[PDB]
Amino acid sequence: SKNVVIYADGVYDMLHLGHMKQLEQAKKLFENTTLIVGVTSDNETKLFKGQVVQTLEERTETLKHIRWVDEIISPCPWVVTPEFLEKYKIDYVAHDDIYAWLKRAGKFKATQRTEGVSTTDLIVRILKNYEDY
């Protein structure tokens, strides 16, 4: 079947199994896809969303090792626009409102976040080896 271009974006700080599963899901939305992943800039992430440990370069270099990722846009724009979709020939945006125009255009595909598998979740498990008392 025809190849389908999928776009996902995010911070991908401290990349963990939850990111990987959501990238796999986006890659597998159709039988033949190209998965483009956008990685948000340090300045815009901190200004608009919250704290980020790793630099853009670190977050991007880790992401390239993930088998589902076919292309990376680093940094990506903070806000997806129709012109951006046209420039990269994107058929669907995969994400878990401001996506209203994407759904109106038929270009939205839902993916899911997995709870309890994050990198900081692992550090909490380490800390729980040390009793309060």
Give the residue with the Cβ less far from a copy of itself, 16 or 84.
Answer: 16
Stretch of residues binding a copy of itself (CB under 8 A), selected from 12-20, 32-40, 71-79, 98-106:
12-20
Strand partners, 105: none
The answer to whether 117 is annotated as binding is no
Q: What type of residue is 11? A: V
> Cβ distance 74 to 38 under 8 Å?
yes
Report the site for a copy of itself in 78-117 (rule: CB under 8 A).
Answer: none
Beta carbon of residue 64, minimum distance to a copy of itself (angstroms, whole number) = 8
The side-by-side arrangement of strands in the sheet containing 108-110 is 71-76, 33-40, 4-10, 92-95, 108-110
CA dist 13 and 51 (Å) reads 9
CA dist 57 and 21 (Å) reads 22
The answer to whether 130 is annotated as binding is no
List 1, 31, 67, 133, residue binding a copy of itself (CB under 8 A): 67
122 near a copy of itself, judged by CB under 8 A: yes
Q: Which residues bind a copy of itself (CB under 8 A)?
A: 14, 16-17, 20, 23-24, 53-54, 58, 61-62, 65-68, 119, 122-123, 125-126
